[PDB]
Amino acid sequence: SKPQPIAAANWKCNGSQQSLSELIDLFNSTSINHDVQCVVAPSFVHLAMTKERLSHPKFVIAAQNAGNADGLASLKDFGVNWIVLGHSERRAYYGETNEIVADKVAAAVASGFMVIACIGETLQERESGRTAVVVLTQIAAIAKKLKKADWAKVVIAYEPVWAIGTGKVATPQQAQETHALIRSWVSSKIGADVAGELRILYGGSVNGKNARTLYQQRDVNGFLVGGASLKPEFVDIIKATQ
Amino acid sequence: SKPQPIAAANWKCNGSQQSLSELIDLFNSTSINHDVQCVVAPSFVHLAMTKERLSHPKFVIAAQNAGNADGLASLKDFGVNWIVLGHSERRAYYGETNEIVADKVAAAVASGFMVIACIGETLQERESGRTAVVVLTQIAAIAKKLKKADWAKVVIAYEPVWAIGTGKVATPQQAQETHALIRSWVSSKIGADVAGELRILYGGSVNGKNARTLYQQRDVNGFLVGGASLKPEFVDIIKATQ
């Protein structure tokens, strides 16, 4: 039995609102049957436009990387209930510590948010066989700052850095493994009820072609999609969560 | 008479040790005629590697988005003396306020760093005529937190968001128009001495072919290069700063 899957979109383009607007209408006209929570995280400056225009009942809006208490509070007052934290990338590029993202997860949860925490290893780490370590260490740090009930507001996205906008995607087995690994750790550290209920999304070069197969994996509960979420094929990715 | 130009390189590719290593060898062996300060901002994860292989006397290492008192101290002990603050992108994508980037610039400068502060408007702001008000508001906010002597540690990069990784470079006159506003503002509010010494760099889809004509503009002092800094043409960009 799987928990509700999630199909999350990461928006970034910097040359219109024309395309976003048309995608939003495409999403607003799409028919979705199965139980799935879709999420669209546009740029901060497109948040207002997106909120008003996006009307599909199975889509919600998420903010990204609100590095501040006042940032969290104003987003929540504005009607935003989701936030995505791009830790894998920020750890690799700027040296953001696991403790700092753990603190931000705890802060976001306490502020009323549903938090999608992006954890993952570098190419060099995956190279030397450290996916296991690196990934569980980030999850361990997060657990240290979360109460058991906090996990109902948390979603884990396994987004390995080497998969992010490179065209390289983890295989349905190579993702199931690190996912199964996360769930078992959570099970034995926090509880079986929390571990089973926990959505563990896969992110990194996902597209309409691979979505179907990755989702068939027992411990994959949806996707975090960047480049492919700016295209009509996202509709396919959603459909693939059944 | 233009102050010393800067050619700044921002690295972010993942599967890169060999590729980066090749570039460094390439840079190390390059002969650079004129007076130019070259800067390389690798991802945190390749800091030590770059610091061990780069040796050209006209090159320094920079950290990107160092956001922590504890993290500057680390950087400072590791021998890194330059930092680049990607504010234009964080403002657009995450809502980062002008006040927060001003606090960071002041923090970095108080700690002995040279700071490249990246300011710029969004596509929407550019299409609606708001570039001037938006850019000038960003520089004024940063100024408020600086003493006159601190400007020696400051470098401004005009980095319009709609030009970052989109291929849409600003025209020579577009960049000169905004650089001129910036410099006019500083000369009037701070001093003509400070304004004439200030390096105002342009960033956004800079490459080997468009660099030359950009640097010919009176108030352009150099470049911030993303995707073209990973390629051999970065050499061309450097040569164009004369």
From Swiss-Prot, chains A, B:
One GO location term (cellular component): cytoplasm
Catalytic reaction list: D-glyceraldehyde 3-phosphate = dihydroxyacetone phosphate
One Pfam short name: TIM
GO biological process: gluconeogenesis; glyceraldehyde-3-phosphate biosynthetic process; glycerol catabolic process; glycolytic process
Catalytic residue positions: H87 (electrophile), E159 (proton acceptor)
Keywords: Gluconeogenesis, Glycolysis, Glycosome, Isomerase, Peroxisome
PROSITE patterns listed in its UniProt record: TIM_1, TIM_2
Sequence positions that bind substrate: N10, K12
UniProt EC number: 5.3.1.1
Predominant localisation class: other
Single annotated GO MF: triose-phosphate isomerase activity
SUPFAM superfamilies membership: Triosephosphate isomerase (TIM)
Location in the cell: Glycosome
Quaternary context: Homodimer.
Any further remark recorded for this protein: The enzyme contains a high proportion of positively-charged residues in beta-barrels V and VII (compared to the homologous regions in other triose isomerase sequences). Since 2 clusters of positive charges located at precise distances on the molecular surface are common to 4 glycosomal enzymes, it has been speculated that this might represent a signal for entry into glycosomes.
NCBIfam families for this protein: tim
Protein family: Belongs to the triosephosphate isomerase family.
Name of the featured protein: Triosephosphate isomerase, glycosomal
